[PDB]
C-alpha cells in the first residue's frame, strides 16, 4: 500500500480493448468473477494444438508519471495442456513480456521488432479444473521492473508461443517512497 | 462468432412476459451483457448466473456472485461470456453442449432495491435469460 498504480486492468469495467496480432484466433478478451467476487476484464489464448504460434497482445499507452523505474505485476493461470482433448505432448509453460517506450500515445500497429524483451515469464503452477465456488489463490504472480525510462510513456506486450494461458490481471505501478 | 449484445433494461423487449429471452449459443461464441447507461433516468441491477431452481423462483443465494453489478449507470459496465468448454482461466466460466444455463436479476430496478434477494424484474418484467448451449 505504498505504490501508485499506472495501470490496473481490474479497474476497467467496460473493456480493455487492447490491440492483438492476430485480432481473432489468438489472444481474446473475456470476463471472469475474480477473487474479490468482482467481474473483471481478462485476456487468454489456448492454441496449444496449432504450431508456430506467435500471438501478440499489446496494452494501451501507459503514462510513467515521470517515474523512471516502473514495476509490472502479472497474475495469470496456465491450463494443463494434457487436460485438453487430444493434446498428448509437453506443454508450453511460458510467455514473453516486452515493452516499448514512446511519446506517441496512439501507436496503430504492433511492430514486433521494435519491442524490447523484459523477460520470459514462467508458470510456477498449472490447473486442470476450473474453480466453481470460492476463489482459491492458486494464480501465478510475477513481478518485473523496467527502467530508467526516458519517454512520456510506454507499451507492454505479451507474446504467446502456444500455451493455454489466461492473464487474470495486469498491474503497472511505481513505488512512491521506495 | 460474436452474438448480439444483450442490454439489461426494462425498456428492452427481448424479455417475453411468457418465458423471457431464449438463446441458442454454440461452443466458441461470445456474448456481452451490458448495464443500462445514461449520459435520462437511472436503472440499477445486479445480474447473476443461476441454476434452474433459482430462476423459476426468481431468488438469489447469499453466496451467489453477480456477473454484472449495474450500480454505476453513467459508466460503461459489461460482462463478456465466452461459451468455451475448456477455460484457460482458473476463474473462468465453462459450458457444455446440450445443457441449459440461466441469467436472472431479482433487483427491482431502483437504487434501494438493488440488493433484493428475490422477486424484482425477474418476477415482474420477466428479465430472465435461458441459454441453450449447443442446441437447435
Ligand atoms: C434496452 O437497452 C438500452 C437502454 O440502455 C436501449 O438502448 C436498447 O435499445 C434496449 N433494447 C435493446 C434490444 O438494446
Residue numbers in the entry:
A (entry chain A): 28 to 205
B (entry chain B): 28 to 66, 71 to 167
From the primary publication:
The EphA4 tyrosine kinase cell surface receptor regulates an array of physiological processes and is the only currently known class A Eph receptor that binds both A and B class ephrins with high affinity. Eph receptors are type 1 membrane proteins with an N-terminal extracellular region consisting of a ligand binding domain (LBD), a cysteine rich region, and two fibronectin type III domains. We have solved the crystal structure of the EphA4 ligand binding domain alone and in complex with (1) ephrinB2 and (2) ephrinA2. Structural analyses, drawing on previously reported Eph receptor structures, show that EphA4 in isolation and in complex with ephrinA2 resembles other class A Eph receptors but on binding ephrinB2 assumes structural hallmarks of the class B Eph receptors. This interactive plasticity reveals EphA4 as a structural chameleon, able to adopt both A and B class Eph receptor conformations, and thus provides a molecular basis for EphA-type cross-class reactivity.
